Amino acid sequence: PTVHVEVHQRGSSTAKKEDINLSVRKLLNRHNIGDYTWTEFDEPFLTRNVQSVSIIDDLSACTVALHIFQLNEDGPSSENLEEETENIIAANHWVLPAAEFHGLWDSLVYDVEVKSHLLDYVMTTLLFSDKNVNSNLITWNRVVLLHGPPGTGKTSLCKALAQKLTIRLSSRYRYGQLIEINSHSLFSKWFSESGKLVTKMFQKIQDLIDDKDALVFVLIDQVESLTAARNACRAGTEPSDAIRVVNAVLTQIDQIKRHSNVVILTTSNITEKIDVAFVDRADIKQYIGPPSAAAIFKIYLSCLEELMKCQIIYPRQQLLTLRELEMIGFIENNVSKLSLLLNDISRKSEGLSGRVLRKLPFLAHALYVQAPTVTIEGFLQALSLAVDKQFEERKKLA
Amino acid sequence: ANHWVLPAAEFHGLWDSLVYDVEVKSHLLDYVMTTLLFSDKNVNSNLITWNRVVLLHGPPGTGKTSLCKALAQKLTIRLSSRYRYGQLIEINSHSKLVTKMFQKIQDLIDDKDALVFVLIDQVESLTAARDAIRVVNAVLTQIDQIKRHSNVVILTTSNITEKIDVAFVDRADIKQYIGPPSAAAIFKIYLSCLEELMKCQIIYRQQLLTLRELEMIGFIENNVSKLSLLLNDISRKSEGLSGRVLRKLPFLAHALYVQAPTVTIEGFLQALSLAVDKQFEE
Ligand SMILES: Nc1ncnc2c1ncn2[C@@H]1O[C@H](COP(=O)(O)OP(=O)(O)OP(O)(O)=S)[C@@H](O)[C@H]1O
C-alpha cells in the first residue's frame, strides 16, 4: 500500500541511485518491522554510502518508496546586479537539498500541522499536473502565504518544505534551487531601488526556471516590504513607487503561473495592511502565532535529548512526552519529576519565539553554569531562571 | 592581516586592562566558554541557536578589538585544556591576501588543541569607502564554510553601530552593545595622555596613581590621590564622551587655561574639569 522512505548519503560516496536503492531495500527486508532512524549499519556497503534512513511523516510489507539525496556544502552563491558597481544587491541563493538544512524539516513543530497541509499541497499539485487538468477550467496560482509574530521559524518552515519535497522529487528532478532576496532591497525602498530590482530578480528566476530537471522554490520573506496598502493616506511621500512594486510582484507571479515546477512561499510580519491583492492572491493563507504548550514541551524534549546525545548532558536520562505524562496519571514519581517540572516550565514559558525558544539553553548555561561539567536536575532550575530573565528583558524593551 | 599566538606575552595582561560598565568580562566569557562547549559535540545546529561570531558595536576604539584580543588571551587562559595552543589573526579591511589567509586559517584549524580565532576589524565598514568585492565575498564564504570546524572562533568587530547589512551580522547569534567606558577606563586614557605629557615636562612631576594604585592605597586622599575625586569629577558627567573626544579633551584643556609652555598638573586638571564642563553644557 502506502509506504515512503528517505535515504541520506555520505558526500564522498559516489554509488548510483539503483545500487544504494537495492541496498536500502535489502535492509528493509532484513528488518521487515513507531518511526525509526537507521544510522548504524551492519552492512558495510551502507556505511560506505548511506548515513541515515528515517521514517518521515510498525508495518513494513508495502510498496518500497526510497529516495536517495546527497547534501551539498555550497551555502552561498552570486545573485545581484553585474553591470558595474553592483555587489551588495544581495539576493541570497541556495542549491536544492544542499547540506545546510538537514533534519530541519522535523526540526520545527506546529500543532496546527500546517506541515501535512503544505506537503500534500504540492503532492496533489503534481497529481493534477500529471492528469493534465485543463488549466483555465480549474486554476490555481502557485502562491502560498503564511504570516504571524516575527521570528516564528517562518523562513525556516519554508526551507524545510523545500528540502522535504526535494527528497520527494529526486524521482522527478535532478535537483532544484532556492531563492531568497529578502531584506536586502526590502528595507531601502528608493526610486526603482525596489522596482527595477524586482524586474531583475524575476528575470533571474524566469531563466533559472525552465530546467524541468530542477524544482524551484521562490522564497519572499518580508512581504510587508512589498505592499503599498493602495495609499491608505493621501501622503504619497513614498506611496507611488510602492504601488509599482506591488504591481511588478503580482504581474511576475501571474506570468510565471505557467511553469510546471515553480512554488512560491511568502511570509509577513504585520498581521494586516499587508495587501489587498496577495491576501486575495493567496492559494492558502496562514497565521502561526506563538506555539502552544504542546510544541513548547516538544522543543524542550528535543533540545534535552540532543544535549544528552551530545554528552553535554552527561548522564543520559529519559523523559515522557505529553500524552505519555498524561498516561502516568500525573504521579509525581522518580521519572516524572523532571518531566512535570518541564511541563510547568512550558506553562510559565508561554508566548515566546522559536528564536528565543531554541536560544534559551545557551544563555542559560552562560549566566548560570559556564561549565561542561554539568548535568540535569540543575540545568532545569538554571534554565528556568534564565527564562525569567528573558521575560524581564522582553519587558525591558517595554 | 597579522598574527598572534595565544597566551604568548605580546598582549599579556590586556585582559583586566579594559574594565567596562555593565561585568561584561565574566559575561562575555560565557560566549566562548559555552560556544566551544556546543562546538565540541556538534549539537542540533539546525535546532539549537549558536554561531561562533563575537560581535559588538559602539563608539569606535572603545577597547572592542582590544577586548577581542585579550579575550582570545583569557580564553586560552581558562581553556588551555581543550587547546594546548591556538592562533589569532588580524583580518584587515585594508585590502590575494584573502585566499592564502583563509588557507593559513585552515592550517590553524587542522589541530584539536589549536583554538582558532577569526579577528576582523570594522567588519561592516567594508561598505564605507565603496574592486575589493571578491575580497568581500571570499571572506564571507570562508566565514560561513569554516564555522563547522570546532576549534574555530569568529571574532567580528562592527566598528559601525546598527548600520550593518545582511551578509554579516543578522547572521549573528550573540551580540552586545556597550556605551562609553567607565570612570576607570576614562582614567586610563587620561593616564595615557598624562604620560605623553610627562614625557618631556609638557605638563610638569607626580607619577599617575593608576586605578589599582588608587585601590591599594586604601583611598588616602593626598597630594596626588585627589586625582580620583577630580577624576570622578572629570568622570561625573563624562558619560557620553567619545574616544575621539575623550583624547581630544586634555588637548582642549591645555588650549583654554594653560596658554603656557607648561603648568603644574593640578591647574591642568581643574582646567580639563572646566573644559568637560563646557563640553557637556552642550
Ligand atoms: N515550531 C518550532 N519548532 C522549532 N524551532 C522553531 C519553531 N518555531 C520557530 N523555531 C525556531 O525559530 C528560529 C527563528 O528562525 P527565523 O527564520 O528567524 O524565524 P522566521 O520564521 O524566519 O521569522 P523571521 O521574520 O524570518 S526572523 C528558527 O531558527 C527555528 O529554529
CSV table of N, CA, C and O and ligand atoms in Angstrom, one decimal, chain A residues 107-110 149-156 221-222 267 269 291 295 299 353-355 358, chain B residues 46-47, ligand 1:
chain,number,residue,atom,x,y,z
A,107,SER,N,12.7,19.4,12.4
A,107,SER,CA,13.1,20.4,13.4
A,107,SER,C,11.9,21.1,14.0
A,107,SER,O,11.5,21.0,15.2
A,108,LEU,N,11.1,21.8,13.1
A,108,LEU,CA,10.0,22.6,13.6
A,108,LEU,C,8.9,21.8,14.0
A,108,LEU,O,8.8,20.6,13.7
A,109,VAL,N,8.0,22.4,14.8
A,109,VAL,CA,6.8,21.8,15.3
A,109,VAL,C,5.6,22.8,15.3
A,109,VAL,O,5.9,23.9,15.7
A,110,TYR,N,4.5,22.4,14.8
A,110,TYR,CA,3.3,23.3,14.8
A,110,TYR,C,2.1,22.4,15.1
A,110,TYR,O,1.7,21.6,14.2
A,149,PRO,N,3.5,36.4,14.2
A,149,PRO,CA,4.6,37.1,15.0
A,149,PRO,C,5.9,36.9,14.4
A,149,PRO,O,6.2,35.8,13.8
A,150,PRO,N,6.8,37.9,14.5
A,150,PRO,CA,8.1,37.7,13.8
A,150,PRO,C,8.9,36.6,14.4
A,150,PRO,O,8.7,36.2,15.5
A,151,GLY,N,9.9,36.2,13.6
A,151,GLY,CA,10.9,35.2,14.1
A,151,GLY,C,10.3,33.8,14.4
A,151,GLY,O,10.9,33.1,15.1
A,152,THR,N,9.1,33.5,13.8
A,152,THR,CA,8.4,32.3,14.2
A,152,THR,C,8.8,31.1,13.4
A,152,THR,O,8.0,30.3,13.0
A,153,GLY,N,10.1,31.0,13.0
A,153,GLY,CA,10.6,30.0,12.2
A,153,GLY,C,9.9,29.9,10.8
A,153,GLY,O,9.8,28.9,10.2
A,154,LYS,N,9.5,31.1,10.4
A,154,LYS,CA,8.7,31.1,9.1
A,154,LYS,C,9.6,30.7,7.9
A,154,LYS,O,9.3,29.7,7.3
A,155,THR,N,10.6,31.5,7.7
A,155,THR,CA,11.6,31.2,6.7
A,155,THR,C,12.1,29.8,6.9
A,155,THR,O,12.3,29.0,5.9
A,156,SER,N,12.4,29.4,8.1
A,156,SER,CA,12.7,28.1,8.4
A,156,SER,C,11.8,27.1,7.8
A,156,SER,O,12.1,26.1,7.2
A,221,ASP,N,10.3,36.3,2.1
A,221,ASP,CA,10.0,36.8,3.4
A,221,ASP,C,9.8,38.4,3.3
A,221,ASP,O,10.1,39.0,2.3
A,222,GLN,N,9.3,38.9,4.4
A,222,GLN,CA,9.2,40.4,4.5
A,222,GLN,C,8.3,41.0,3.4
A,222,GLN,O,8.6,42.0,2.9
A,267,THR,N,6.1,35.1,3.5
A,267,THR,CA,5.8,35.3,4.9
A,267,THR,C,5.8,36.8,5.2
A,267,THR,O,6.4,37.6,4.5
A,269,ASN,N,5.4,40.0,8.5
A,269,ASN,CA,5.4,40.3,9.9
A,269,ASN,C,4.1,40.9,10.4
A,269,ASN,O,3.4,40.4,11.3
A,291,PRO,N,3.6,29.2,19.8
A,291,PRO,CA,3.4,27.8,19.8
A,291,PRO,C,2.6,27.4,21.1
A,291,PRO,O,2.9,28.0,22.2
A,295,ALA,N,3.9,22.2,21.5
A,295,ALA,CA,5.1,22.4,20.8
A,295,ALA,C,6.2,22.9,21.7
A,295,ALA,O,7.4,22.5,21.4
A,299,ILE,N,9.8,20.9,21.9
A,299,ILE,CA,11.0,21.6,21.6
A,299,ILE,C,12.0,21.3,22.8
A,299,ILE,O,13.2,21.1,22.7
A,353,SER,N,9.2,33.2,21.2
A,353,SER,CA,9.6,33.0,19.8
A,353,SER,C,10.5,31.8,19.7
A,353,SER,O,11.5,31.7,20.5
A,354,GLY,N,10.3,30.9,18.8
A,354,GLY,CA,11.2,29.9,18.5
A,354,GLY,C,12.6,30.3,18.4
A,354,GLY,O,13.6,29.6,18.8
A,355,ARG,N,12.8,31.5,17.9
A,355,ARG,CA,14.1,32.2,18.0
A,355,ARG,C,14.6,32.2,19.4
A,355,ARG,O,15.6,31.5,19.8
A,358,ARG,N,14.6,28.2,21.1
A,358,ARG,CA,15.8,27.4,20.9
A,358,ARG,C,17.0,28.3,21.0
A,358,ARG,O,18.1,27.9,20.7
B,46,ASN,N,20.9,22.9,13.2
B,46,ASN,CA,19.6,23.4,12.7
B,46,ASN,C,18.7,23.8,13.8
B,46,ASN,O,18.0,24.8,13.7
B,47,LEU,N,18.7,23.1,14.9
B,47,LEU,CA,17.8,23.4,16.0
B,47,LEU,C,18.4,24.5,16.9
B,47,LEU,O,17.8,25.6,17.0
C,1,LIG,N1,7.9,25.2,16.0
C,1,LIG,C1,9.2,25.4,16.0
C,1,LIG,N2,10.0,24.3,16.3
C,1,LIG,C2,11.3,24.5,16.3
C,1,LIG,N3,12.0,25.6,16.2
C,1,LIG,C3,11.2,26.7,15.9
C,1,LIG,C4,9.8,26.6,15.8
C,1,LIG,N4,9.3,27.9,15.5
C,1,LIG,C5,10.4,28.6,15.4
C,1,LIG,N5,11.6,28.0,15.7
C,1,LIG,C6,12.9,28.5,15.6
C,1,LIG,O1,12.9,29.9,15.5
C,1,LIG,C7,14.1,30.3,14.8
C,1,LIG,C8,13.9,31.6,14.2
C,1,LIG,O2,14.1,31.5,12.8
C,1,LIG,P1,13.6,32.6,11.8
C,1,LIG,O3,13.7,32.1,10.4
C,1,LIG,O4,14.3,33.9,12.0
C,1,LIG,O5,12.1,32.8,12.2
C,1,LIG,P2,11.2,33.1,11.0
C,1,LIG,O6,10.0,32.2,10.8
C,1,LIG,O7,12.1,33.1,9.7
C,1,LIG,O8,10.8,34.6,11.2
C,1,LIG,P3,11.7,35.7,10.6
C,1,LIG,O9,10.9,37.1,10.5
C,1,LIG,O10,12.2,35.3,9.2
C,1,LIG,S1,13.2,36.0,11.7
C,1,LIG,C9,14.4,29.2,13.8
C,1,LIG,O11,15.8,29.0,13.6
C,1,LIG,C10,13.8,27.9,14.5
C,1,LIG,O12,14.8,27.1,15.0
